[PDB]
């Protein structure tokens, strides 16, 4: 309804003193699919929904606040120190009480093993991201088994994100060998160390259950369990209305209307750094391998109309996202989309200059029709995106062939392997925006699914990560963004409204925006608990 889709500095979580909440309870949430791999560092396990679930179970070195600021999570680390600024040396000192769910203590070996596994040194690890691990020169033992000193060969401002935010620490048994990394977590997660532990994976009931970790050495959680139910997008709001789940996202105006009409449901809003997009495939043999064709096609997709249709009534003055690196409300955000501003007449002119002429119902060249397979995850909103782009592209002689898909293998079986010309999906960021550059946009980026890149983009990413000054680094990242747009890599569409529908009884849970949850503090309020001191 009235707030802008822009990242702010607040959470909307109905903060309450957890000691005043009920003792016990079952937080019921939904999942889109069982993951094909539970290793969230793996190229097949980089699923935001699963990572979100795992945050309740795995160590994270820092707590992120609603403004993106970090503090050391002393449950997992006695201290974390920038031992030396340049060359960068970081000393992680592990909380001696920290233990994995198999009794093994957390040691420096877990940090060393994880950094090695995602460093790119050994190509056998099929990783989703390096999070700058390729920039560490060494991980060595500090004063005892519980201390790791990470020495960098190159600057890396966002080192705090290695084991925090969307990053988190895995046990060496799951990262030490390519076999365990790639295949050890196919049927379920390995050992963990957090307030909750995954205790049940029911593929028949399509349910995953998290219960209190017996070995947890920190604050006892208020919840007995967190239960995830597999539900398709259309089933989510009805499940909330029928009292089968307790919270779910609100992605459309009609969803907001249904949720807000529902007794016992509250609407929380805190936009986070996540967005939806068209990603283009430029791999050899793909029709969009031609850069000029990518830029021409892009000029025929009306991202502004798409954003207005997607977000009207849900957010105020809806606009599309115009940046790959920063989103609205973030420092450094700016509009770098002009190289592919919507211009159908110019698109037609450029298509003619390339020999994609109106020889038939759609444009043609060398006996091939100008058809673009659009791969997306079938749902009402995503089909809407596809349909609008289809309409505008048809108007310039371009045929968008919709290829809607479903299931656990949307990424592992289609996106990850280049089975598309355009793919619609979302990226889910955190407080560390620069860490996406090497992952997605570098020529050898592990998540560069479309294999689109250039030496100029690579060099601009290098300059961005070498820069120690934050403002200059933001400038350099925006130059990177300019190059990304000019390469026809992808078209950002909408960033997240941050609207969530939550059972009104829940406290310390809701729309978090940039912030982490304290999973020990989530709980249900007692009857007639109607005060709100926050």
């Amino acid at each position: 309804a009235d707030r802008r889709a822009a990242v702010g500095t607040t959470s909307d979580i109905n903060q309450q003193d957890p000691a005043t909440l009920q003792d016990g309870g079952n937080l019921r949430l939904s999942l889109t699919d069982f993951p094909p791999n539970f290793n969230i560092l793996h190229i097949d396990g980089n699923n935001a929904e699963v990572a979100a679930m795992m945050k309740a179970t795995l160590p994270r070195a820092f707590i992120i606040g609603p403004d993106g600021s970090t503090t050391v999570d002393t449950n997992y680390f006695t201290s974390i120190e920038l031992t030396r600024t340049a060359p960068q040396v970081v000393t992680y000192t592990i909380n001696p009480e920290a233990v994995w769910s198999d009794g093994t203590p957390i040691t420096w070996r877990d940090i060393a093993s994880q950094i090695h596994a995602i460093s790119g040194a050994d190509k056998a690890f099929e990783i989703a991201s390096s999070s700058g691990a390729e920039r560490v020169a060494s991980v060595t033992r500090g004063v005892d088994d519980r201390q790791a000193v990470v020495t960098f060969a190159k600057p890396y401002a966002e080192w705090r994100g290695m084991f925090a935010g969307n990053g988190m620490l895995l046990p060496a048994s799951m990262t030490a060998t390519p076999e365990a990394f790639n295949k050890g977590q196919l049927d379920g997660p390995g050992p963990s160390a957090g307030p909750f532990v995954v205790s049940a994976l029911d593929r028949t009931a399509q349910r995953i259950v998290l219960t209190r970790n017996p070995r947890w050495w920190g604050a006892r959680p208020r919840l007995d369990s967190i239960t995830y139910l597999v539900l398709d997008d259309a089933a989510r709001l009805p499940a909330l209305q029928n009292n089968t789940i307790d919270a779910t996202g609100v992605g459309t105006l009609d969803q907001l209307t249904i949720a807000a009409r529902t007794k016992g449901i509250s609407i929380r809003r805190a936009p986070g750094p996540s967005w939806y997009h068209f990603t283009l495939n430029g791999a050899p043999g793909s029709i969009l391998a031609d850069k000029a064709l990518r830029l021409a096609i892009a000029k025929g997709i009306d991202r502004y109309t798409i954003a207005r249709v997607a977000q009207y009534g849900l957010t105020s003055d809806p606009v599309p996202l115009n940046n790959h690196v920063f989103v609205a409300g973030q420092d450094g955000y700016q509009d770098n989309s002009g190289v592919v501003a919507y211009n159908p007449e110019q698109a037609k002119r450029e298509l003619d200059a390339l020999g994609w002429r109106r020889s038939g119902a759609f444009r043609e060249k060398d006996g091939r029709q100008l058809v673009i397979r659009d791969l997306f995850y079938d749902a009402q909103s995503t089909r809407q995106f596809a349909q609008i782009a289809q309409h505008t592209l048809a108007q310039i002689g371009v045929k968008l062939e919709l290829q809607a898909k479903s299931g656990s293998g949307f990424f592992s079986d289609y996106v990850n392997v280049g089975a598309f010309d355009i793919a619609q999906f979302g990226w889910v960021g955190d407080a560390f925006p620069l860490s996406s550059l090497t992952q997605i946009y570098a020529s050898d980026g592990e998540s560069n699914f479309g294999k689109i890149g250039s030496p100029q983009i690579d060099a601009a990413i290098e300059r961005t990560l070498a820069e120690l000054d934050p403002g200059k680094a933001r400038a350099l990242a925006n130059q990177v963004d300019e190059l990304i747009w000019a390469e026809g890599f992808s078209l950002p569409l909408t960033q997240s409204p941050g609207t969530v529908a939550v059972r009104s009884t829940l406290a310390n849970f809701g729309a978090t925006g940039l912030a982490d949850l304290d999973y020990t503090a989530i709980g249900f309020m007692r009857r007639h608990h109607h005060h709100h001191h926050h």
Binding site: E49, A128, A310, V428, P433, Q439
Partner: peptide, 9 residues
């Protein structure tokens, strides 16, 4: 933007 999701976040 390290993890992905199939639906508009």
């Amino acid at each position: 933007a390290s993890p992905f999701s199939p639906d508009p976040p």
